[PDB]
């Protein structure tokens, strides 16, 4: 699952007349403060990040519980046919069926790469809020 989707890095490019128009707009505008990055309360942005993860691991729990049963299908049937090996080979000396399919394994790779999308983002979410928590340790720091 590491080469399941490789990532290509993005670099921003423009002409210089957009940089004129970036310099043109920024002066002539209303003052839109950029404050929305350092927000320091998100627990339902974190909550639905983890709740959408939990149903796919429960989907992953569904996939390997039946993977026991597919082995529970085959572990009986291999010994039952080797019982039928020892049943039928003893039969012709004294005279002188369907194997199951597994769960189809592209969905089991699709769930791990989907849980790979939860793993990179919620841990990048982790120090993202913890950075604004630790800069806020410096905000209360003089106040007695």
């Amino acid at each position: 699952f590491e080469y399941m989707f490789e990532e290509v890095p993005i670099v921003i490019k423009n002409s210089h007349l957009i940089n004129v128009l970036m310099w043109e707009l920024e002066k002539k505008s209303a003052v839109a403060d950029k404050h929305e990055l350092l927000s320091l309360a998100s627990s339902n942005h974190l909550g639905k990040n983890l709740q959408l993860l939990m149903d796919r691991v429960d989907e992953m729990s569904q996939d390997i519980v039946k993977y026991n049963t597919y082995m529970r299908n085959t572990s009986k049937q291999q010994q039952q046919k080797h019982q039928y090996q020892q049943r039928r080979q003893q039969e012709n000396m004294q005279r002188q069926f369907k194997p199951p399919q597994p769960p189809a394994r592209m969905d089991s790779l699709l769930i791990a790469g989907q849980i790979n999308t939860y793993c990179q983002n919620i841990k990048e979410f982790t120090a993202q809020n913890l950075g604004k928590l630790f800069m806020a340790q410096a905000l209360q720091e003089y106040n007695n």
Partner: protein
């Protein structure tokens, strides 16, 4: 204007205050004192009421209603709306200082009874000047913040050493957060 042609600045100098003393939401009477005509004018005219308003408190105005019933009531002004401004500016200047302040102060400073406080605290917390709170069970007024009437060189000085360590504490994290990558 300048000091020279502040002689003609009589009629709007009356008008700017007595339109704004009709206005119950004009809250800065410090900007009406920083003018070149207004320090030049003194006497009975309405600038004399401003020094009762800005630094001074309701003890300095409840004398003044006994002296002139005529002159404050003459031009543009009714008295009880002026009172509720002066109810605020004593209490707002009190709520700068203590921020642990009890209930009995305002029955004794602002001269109302015991149950007239709790509607009146909402009047201060609505219009944006002091955001106050009541721990009403333990009979306390905890406030969050308060606004000042005139500055001083102490007043810049509290702003300096609070902000200087706050720059210095953010110097440490600007070092530490950019050094991660």
């Amino acid at each position: 204007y300048t000091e020279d042609n502040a002689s003609q600045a009589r009629v709007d100098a009356h008008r700017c205050i007595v339109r704004a003393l009709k206005d119950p939401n004009a809250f800065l009477f410090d900007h009406l004192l920083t003018l070149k005509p207004v320090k030049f004018l003194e006497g009975e005219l309405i600038h004399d009421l401003l020094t009762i308003f800005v630094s001074a408190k309701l003890a300095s105005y409840v004398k003044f209603y006994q002296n002139n019933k005529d002159f404050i009531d003459s031009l543009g002004l009714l008295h009880e709306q002026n009172m509720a401004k002066m109810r605020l500016l004593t209490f707002m200047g009190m709520a700068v200082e203590n921020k642990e302040i009890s209930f009995d102060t305002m029955q004794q400073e602002l001269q109302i009874g015991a149950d007239d406080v709790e509607a009146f605290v909402i009047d201060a917390v609505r219009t944006k000047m002091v955001y106050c709170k009541i721990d009403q069970t333990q009979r306390k007024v905890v406030v969050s913040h308060s606004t000042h009437r005139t500055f001083g060189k102490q007043q810049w000085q509290q702003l300096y050493d609070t902000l200087n360590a706050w720059k210095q504490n953010l110097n440490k994290v600007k070092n530490s957060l950019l050094s991660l990558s």
